[PDB]
Structures are given as C-alpha cells and as structure tokens.
Design a binder for this molecule. Sequence first.
Ligand SMILES: NC(=O)c1ccc[n+]([C@@H]2O[C@H](COP(=O)([O-])OP(=O)(O)OC[C@H]3O[C@@H](n4cnc5c(N)ncnc54)[C@H](OP(=O)(O)O)[C@@H]3O)[C@@H](O)[C@H]2O)c1
Ligand SMILES: [Mn+2]
Length: 723
Amino acid sequence: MIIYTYTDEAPALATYSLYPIIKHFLEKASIDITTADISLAGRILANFPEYLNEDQKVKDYLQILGELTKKSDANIIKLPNISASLPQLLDCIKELQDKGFKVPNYPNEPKDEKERLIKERYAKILGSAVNPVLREGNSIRRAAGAVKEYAKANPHSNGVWNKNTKTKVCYMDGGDFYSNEKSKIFENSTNLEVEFIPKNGDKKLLKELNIQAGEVVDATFMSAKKLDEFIAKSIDLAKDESLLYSVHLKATMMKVSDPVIFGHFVKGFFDEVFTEFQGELKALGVNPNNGLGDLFIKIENSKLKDKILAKFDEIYASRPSLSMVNSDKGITNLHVPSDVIIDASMPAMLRNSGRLWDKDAKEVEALAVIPDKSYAVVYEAMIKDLKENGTLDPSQIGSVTNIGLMAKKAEEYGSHDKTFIIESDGQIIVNDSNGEEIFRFEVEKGDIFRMTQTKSEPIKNWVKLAFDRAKLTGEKAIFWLDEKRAHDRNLIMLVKDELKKYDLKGFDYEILDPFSATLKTNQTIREGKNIISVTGNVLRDYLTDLYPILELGTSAKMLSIVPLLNGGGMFETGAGGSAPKHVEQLVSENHLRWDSLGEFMALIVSLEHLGTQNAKILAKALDKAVSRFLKEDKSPKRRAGEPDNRNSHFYLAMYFADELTKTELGNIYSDLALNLKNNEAKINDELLSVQGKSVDLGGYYKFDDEKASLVMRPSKTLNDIIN
Ligand SMILES: NC(=O)c1ccc[n+]([C@@H]2O[C@H](COP(=O)([O-])OP(=O)(O)OC[C@H]3O[C@@H](n4cnc5c(N)ncnc54)[C@H](OP(=O)(O)O)[C@@H]3O)[C@@H](O)[C@H]2O)c1
Ligand SMILES: [Mn+2]
C-alpha cells in the first residue's frame, strides 16, 4: 500500500489533477494507493470531532501515518504541508466556522479548564506538527542526473554578484543560542530535571526528561537585552548604508522561540507605537508576536485607530526601507510571522542579485538580519564567495547531495516542548536522578531558554548513510560541524567514534565548521565536481533550499529519500514547501506555475521501494517518461496564457503510457497511450483556454471538492480518458 499525502495550497491543488492520473496507472497495474488528509484544515477537523456532524469528521491521519512509519514496511509519498503560524491557524479556524464546521475559537487566555485543554490541542497543531512525527529516519536529498542535466541544458538566472554588491548578513555577537550553548553525551540512562530559581520568588520545575544511553542533550538561551540592542544596531546600520531592512527567521517550525524573536523585531522597529499605545494595544489584545496584520485587524475598533496609523507613517519615515512580501497590498516582512522563512527567503534574495523589494516594488540591496550566528555564517560565506567569484553558473556547477540528521525529532526540531520564556531574573539549573548539577545559566526576564535531544541510533545511522553514499559515488563528504559549539564538538567525538567501526580506505571526508564547509563546497562545485554535505537537522533544511535553488531554480526538483529505521520508506516530493504564492496566481488568473516534477520522482522511488514485478516495470518506464518530459521541456511556465501544472500532468501521462506500450504490460496501456497521443492538441487547448480568469475554489485551507476538481480538471476529453 502506497499512501499519497493530501496537504495544503499549491501541492493540494496539483493533487486534484495528478492523483486521478497516478491512480488510473497504478490501478491498471493492480498497485494499491490511497490519500491521507494531513492538510491544516483536516488536522484541525480530526482534532475537534465532538464539535462536528458525522460527514464533517476526519480520521487522525497524522496518528495513522505516525504508526505506519514504525511498521516493518511503509511506503509514504509526502508532499509539502503547512507548519502553521497562529495567524494561519486563526484564519483556518475562521474559514471552517464560516462553512458550518463548528470548531472552537483559539482562546489566547483560557477562562476555564475547558478553554485550557482547547488551547493545548491547537498548540500541538501549530508549527511543524507532521514532519517531526513522520521523520522516523534520516534524509538523503540530491538531484537525479536527468534533473541536473535539465538545469545545465536549460539554465535559470542566478542574477549578478561583484565586490560592488553591498548585500550583507547581520547576526548577534554574544547573547545568542550559539554563544550560551552547553552540551553533554550521556553514557547511561538518567532522568533530568529543569528548575527555575528567581532571585526573588519560589523555585519551579519547568521540565522532566527521560534521557537514554548515548543521547546528546544541549541547553542554551538568547538574551532579550542583547537581542534588543542588536535589533536597534541592525536597524541603524540599515539606515546608514541605505540597505533595505529584511528579517529571516523560522517562526513556523521554531513555534516557541521565533514568534518571540519576531515580536522583538516588531516592538523594536515600531518602538514609538508600542510606547504611545502600550495600554491601548494591551487592552485590544495585541501580541506583537503575531505581526502587523493581527495588530491592524485589532485596531479596526479603537478610538485611537487613525492616531495609531499616523504614528506608523512617522516611524516608516525615520526608519530604513522595510522588505515587502507584497508591495501592492502594503504587506511587510513584519505583517505575518510565516511569510518570510529563512530557508526559502535567503536564496530567493541571493538569486535576485542580493536585491529584495520596497514599498514601490523597487529591487534594492538588502541587509539580511539573522539573529543567531550558528547558521547565519553559512549565508555570510555564500555571500563572500559570490562577491569574490561572481554568481554560481547553473550550466557549469556540480551538485550538492545532503545527508541530514533528522530521526526522532533531532536537535532544534524537537526543542519546542523544551523551550521556555524566563518569567523574571533568576537562574536555570538542570539535574539528573543522582542530583548532579549538569547545566546552570544566569538568565533574565524575557530570555529564551532552550534544550535539545539527539539520540545515538539517529547519529549512528546518519554516519552509515554518508559513508555508504560516498562509497557508492566516490564524492568528497564534508561533515558541517563547528568545534566552537558544544553540541557540534560532541557530534565530532560521536562521528569519530562511529567511523572507527568502518574501513576509511576510499572514504574521502573532511570535518569543517559551516563557514569553511560552505567555501569548500562552493570551490568544489565551481570546478564542476559533485560534493556531499553531512549536516544537522537545520542545515539539512537550509542547504537543500540554498544549493538546489541556485543549481535547479526551486528545491522542489530534488529527490528526498527517508529510509525509516524500522525498514519503511518515506519519499518527499522535493525539499520545498507548499508555495502559497502559486495559489494567489491560480485564484486571480487560473494559472498554476507549481512544478510537480518532484511528485513524479518521489513516485518513481516509491515504486522501486514497493519492488513488485509491476512496480519495477512502472518505475523504469516512469523514469524514461520523466527523462522525455525534461528533454521536451514540459515543466510548467509562469505567465497566464502559457502551459501550466495541468498541461505538464498531461505530457507526463502521454509519455508514461507511451513508455509502458514497449514493456511486458503493453496490451494494458495501448489504448491509453493512443487515446492521449490522438488527443494531444485537443486536450492541450481544453487546459490552456480556461486560463486568464479568476476562479472560485470554495475556500483556501479547505476547498469545495466539486469546484477544485472543476478548476484543476477542466478538460472533458482528458477526464473521459482518465476516468
Ligand atoms: N512540509 C515540508 O516539507 C515543508 C518544507 C518547507 C516549507 N513548508 C511550508 O510551506 C509553506 C511555504 O514555505 P516557504 O514560503 O518557506 O517556501 P516555499 O513553498 O518552498 O517557497 C515557494 C517559492 O519557491 C518556488 N517553489 C517552491 N516549490 C515549487 C514547485 N513545486 N514548483 C516550482 N517552484 C516552487 C517557488 O518560487 P516562485 O514564486 O518563484 O514561483 C515559490 O514561490 C509554509 O507553510 C511552510 O511551513 C513545508
Ligand atoms: Mn521552503
């Protein structure tokens, strides 16, 4: 059984067109496949059944697939899905209520234990709820030969870069998680205790943790005062040097830390509003953590509305130009916490000649504020090397493979339950079963305290993948590990320990700090050689947007293979997200520029993994079909009135069917091959000719299925072939 994930936004809409096609082909080969609704709307419905009519209820597909990942064999095609910010959860709740799905309001401040439990249910739904539960395995992300050869044959622009390019990252120097980090390997299984001790007040037990034999636990904090001084410093450096102010966080997955960090940026930039209106904004229930969008919604009803708006205008005037998400709608990099996400936002910036957009959609060289230095140094290096050697030439450069440590919520991706905001000046102490003081921190009011767990089987497995992949291909493999970080220093000892079990003859490997590892991998791919990155859970994410965007245009054209520790497979339809922007263009203009190429390729490896006589026949033929797809350049176009996602589904269908008539399954596919060849022009015209009008999908987070299929499946003659 293959499970296909129904998710959100762009891939959700693609799936309305592509799934019936996948389905037609697998059914005819007696291969079993279904969908699972892990959409943000579906997850919410599945979690509040007691509020719903029976036909409204949704199975807890997150729980079902979580179980499946631990089973001796599982086959999941995982499409990108929303890691919700609060403003997205609030918008999804609304959309459901308005449609008579009667789910409860988010209580910001619960009155009773009833409202307490409801806030805690929604809190589990916020942020990266799905990926950390499904990722019961480490990660292989790489560009298939045929996809790289497409990039080389059909090169995108990586813009223009020189010593005159004034684009720069800005990160804190002391005060950040990197500076304050401590770590410990645990040889024996002990139980930990995290207690706060305020210089006046009672002690408090913040957290209890089961630690197992082998686990690396770290602890750290960011200083609210260093953060606040750094934000002011970073704002005045922007204004001085005439750089556009841009802020790149992870307020999605980092669902406790990064909205808090994000709120300091909003309080910091607009400090005169949070001074003149401290009490009015409090009374209106304004949390700066939610962005300007929630603030402007909350001051619609305030006697001081216009006086608040004239104050913004006065601040914008004294301040450096703010990076915009949407210039036409006045939406800023500080309107909604989920809109600018570092992994996607920094490489779009780098490709566009280090330019981002201002109020008037003018492209302007940017200050890239990334508070923590741990990963900021990666973009610094990348930026240094673009200035020295010019842009990375997609037609010339070699390919970065990533072996990413993920399994069992490794490193900062399991930190949400272990992140706390310090109520008052005090100290954190952390103790074991015996009662030994393992960590201690002098912390202050507003300080962001955090810990992390990375276990031994995850680390041990992650080495085997990098070793085995390097023996397979001959490529150099760099472990990106900063000896100036305690967490990293513990991983070096653990890699070194584990490599003593392996024959290191043939295994070309270095260990470099992320800064140095970046210049070495850039140096290697300029020459045109392939290289392997062996990284942590966050670099896994950052690097498989960075290099893939530079080398292929979008990270969605990558393979993303997760060999689950219990022997299943999860295959992710690229290294990208749910591309909300593609949705805006589908609504307004009936053109989806979403490329499904990562879905095609996920499906190829899903079939190899199935490994049935027919699965291998459909895999080998689909691979040939995708090669033809890339040779004939069928990938969607961007402008309305040009062929889109739907047309590309058609061309893959035609090519797949054709390729299957050459195989032992030919008789089965002969009529489909002929019917799609003979209707090529008629079908392409049916799909094009609906483009250039706005469309009613009946929703955004939850579509009206009838309307979504009419928009995504608008070709009667393709439909009559496919069903
Ligand atoms: N579940 C996952 O694995 C995963 C991973 C990352 C992000 N997300 C989620 O996705 C949402 C958006 O995240 P984001 O804004 O960081 O990044 P995003 O969806 O990856 O960024 C989208 C931009 O990258 C290009 N792109 C991405 N996928 C593409 C595809 N299949 N075909 C063609 N171009 C593609 C597109 O650029 P153009 O505009 O130039 O066309 C798009 O605007 C968030 O809700 C986030 O939580 C999920
Ligand atoms: Mn992304």
